[PDB]
Amino acid sequence: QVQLQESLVRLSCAASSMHVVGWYRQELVASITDDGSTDYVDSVKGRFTISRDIAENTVYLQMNNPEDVYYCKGIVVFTTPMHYWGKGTQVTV
Amino acid sequence: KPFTLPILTLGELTNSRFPLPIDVLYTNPNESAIVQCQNGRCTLDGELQGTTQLLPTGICAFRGKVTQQVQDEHRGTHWNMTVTNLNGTPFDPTEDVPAPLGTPDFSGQIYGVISQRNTNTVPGEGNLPANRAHEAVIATYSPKFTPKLGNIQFSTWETQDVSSGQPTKFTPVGLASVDANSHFDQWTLPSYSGALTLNMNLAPSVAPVFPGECLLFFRSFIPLKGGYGNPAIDCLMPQEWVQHLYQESAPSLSDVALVRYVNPETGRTLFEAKLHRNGFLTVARNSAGPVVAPTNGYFRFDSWVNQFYTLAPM
Amino acid sequence: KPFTLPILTLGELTNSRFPLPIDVLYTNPNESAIVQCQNGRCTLDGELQGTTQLLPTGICAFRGKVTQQVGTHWNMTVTNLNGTPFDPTEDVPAPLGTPDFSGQIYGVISQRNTNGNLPANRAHEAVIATYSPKFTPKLGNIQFSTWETQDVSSGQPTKFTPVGLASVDANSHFDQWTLPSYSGALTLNMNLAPSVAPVFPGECLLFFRSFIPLKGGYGNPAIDCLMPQEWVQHLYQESAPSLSDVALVRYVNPETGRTLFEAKLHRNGFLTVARNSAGPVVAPTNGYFRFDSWVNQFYTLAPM
User: Which terminus of chain B, N or C, has fewer Cβ atoms within 10 Å?
Assistant: First the structure.
């Protein structure tokens, strides 16, 4: 119902306020919640950094290897989530 | 006029407490809860009780109008809805019913779709009314669930596209969750007027009266929006029995009707049960769980008996 | 065994072609389309026709398993509603309950996995375009689309609960009297319940009309059935011998005791009235049809 939008060696996500926003790849990469809490897959730990920016209306994924398409995913009602996916952006190193 | 049941296999029956097909016959003799559901309640001589109505489309349905967006202490976007009778007439809270007919009769997060069709046309948008529909959840255990007072609340994932003051329909689909915090309990009634008020005009509780018997249920499995679980909803009689009993209105000639579950191919009785005047089944059984019976079987009325009749064990 | 109809007002009837209450009786004599719906078809002596089955929950429902991803589109094998595999050589147009009109049908796809010993679940809004070349229920396969992009599981029990239409705009091909091609472009429809029409001048079909919800956009779409689902169920139960061509029925007001109009209920299971205008039958909410007597087709109805 919302329309998420992302962005080969700053990706922005934009919608048509969400409870979690996360970046994926093809597996989970990095996520941030509206508590400001973050989490990372073990293979990305230390090199990757998720960060929320309310002022600029987007969620960035700063990535600091050849084993690295990336997607934006965004709402909870009671304790039941619904997820909203963007269409993606390729990443190749 | 002689009492009859319809001739319908389990595969031709639907649940009277949620819009689902019947999946299996079921017993649970170790049930500690008082069984007092309000949908699927009909006496054998055709008196609907509780919140029971005839439409399969009315079970756990609501009709009304959204008044405004509201706040509540849980995640989501929240909306207040006045509710009418399902036939569109204003609900009169002083009527002798527990709640508008069709109101859900159990505690849980009921998941479905809210849809609206506007009454008006807007200048510049054309001569046909606008529409919208979104997934929604109604927590029947919430203090804001007050259908007997003529209004309820629902929550959506959608944050803006629900219109105030427009005709609104809730189509039930399943449950949102059966996790700890979601309070699914099929035998716990909602407080239809909210937390501060007693329920009224209830269909009575049901139980076997002869020792060694237990209730027999028609069980359906109910969909989940997400999470883990295999939730089920047990009704006392399928909706087609409610409809048939209402049509026939046959006088009940004793307190208990002996019925036999028969295999039409062999003509043989698979097991027997008591069909009580208030509208529920008991059997003599020493296993709990789903009933193993051939798919072509159905209940046939045999004769009127008394409360002391001894059933053959299943 | 005497022929009977149940005693049910419009407010106690449901549509046999979509899970909706009946809202109004309706005529439309100038309909150019062939009326040949496949749900809500039952003879007066209780023989189901077309894709008609008895469950209100089965109307426009599907049961099956998702095979793969193909908006986002998913391919789904469909079974009979009782879970048994559908045999395409069976003498039916499609699995019983299959939608019988062209449109974008909107509803919810839900899944409960086969494997604390409790299965995972998911449900999403979904749309089934019955006019698509991939709508092939007679071949045991259909496609549905979701707004949801990823969380639909392959090889898991899947249920479609119908709710309304996605749209009735031009590109949505809603036409309640256009049948789906149940086998797609590959073969013509088979074993169909026959088309219905008045045979004598001055008569037209009488419909039980329901308004169907919309996911979005503009419109007030309706779905018209020939007999409500409760009549299908009743006829199936009773199986009363049909004694002539037509059951003459009278629509009566129980409060005044007066007959409002009469109709022919044809053996194949549809109504005609003597009317030559389109629109609602304006009738008291307490009215219902009562069987009067068997007549032949040459009976002349009083104008309603």
Answer: N
- Residue B203's identity, in one-letter code, is A
The CATH T-level fold of domain C1-58+167-304 is Nucleoplasmin-like/VP (viral coat and capsid proteins) (2.40.510)
- Residue C182's CB is within 10 A of a number of other CB atoms, namely 27
Residue C79 CB burial class (10 angstroms; 0-12, 13-18, ≥19): middle
What are the backbone dihedrals phi and psi of residue C82, each rounded to the nearest 5 degrees, phi first?
Answer: -80, 5
Answer whether A85 touches C (CB < 8 Å): yes
Length of chain C, in residues = 304
CB contact under 8 A, A77 and B157: yes
β-partners of residue A71 are A24
Q: How far apart are CA C80 and CA C98, in angstroms?
A: 10
Alpha carbons C134 and C130: distance in angstroms, whole number = 8
In 3D, which of C122, A77, C108 has the Cα closest to residue B181? A77
Say which experimental method was used. Answer: X-ray
CB of C113 less than 8 A from some CB of B = no
Q: How far is CA C91 from CA B40, C45, C51, C233, C267, in A?
A: 36, 20, 10, 21, 21
Fold category of B59-176 in CATH? Elongation Factor Tu (Ef-tu); domain 3 (2.40.30)
Which residues does chain C have within 8 Å of residue B240's beta carbon, measured at their own beta carbons? 233
Interface test with A, best of B75, B77, B113 (most A CBs within 10 A): B75
Interface of B with A (CB under 8 A): 74-77, 109, 111, 134-135, 137, 139, 155-159, 161, 176-177, 179, 181-182, 225-227
